[PDB]
């Protein structure tokens with residue numbers, strides 16, 4: 169099976185390297201990027217991100233609901249366009265299919 173957990177870990181490394189301020193919105197705010205793997209808040213969040221990817225692929229993802237929840241954190245189209253770029257890099261590093269179409273689905277509700 170595709171190692172989505174690894175892809176997700178690379179995604180967050182890219183995302184927070186390019187936009188460290190995004191990290192302030194999470195429970196692992198202020199935690200050094202190289203140490204996120206040992207952080208409990210991060211582990212939970214990464215697992216949910218992996219779950220969402222598997223749900224998008226599986227056909228059960230609620231993109232409208234995810235979009236609405238991100239709006240509820242003042243995270244919008246600009247952030248998701250940046251995310252799309254970091255996720256594209258992360259997917260290629262692991263021989264994984266691109267997930268741009270899934271981010272587009274979320275963006276369609278933002």
Ligand code: HEM
Pocket residue numbers: 190191193194195213216217220221234237238241243247248251252255271
């Ligand atoms: C590939 C793009 C993204 C995906 C697939 C994604 C996915 C998710 C999922 C599944 C959750 C959990 C939602 C729930 O529990 O119902 C979540 C929460 C969250 N996301 Fe994202 N997200 C993405 C991009 C971003 C970006 C760019 C930001 C910018 C800050 C962001 C900020 C947040 C925040 C603040 C939460 C809530 C964290 C908490 O509850 O402590 N997300 N995201």
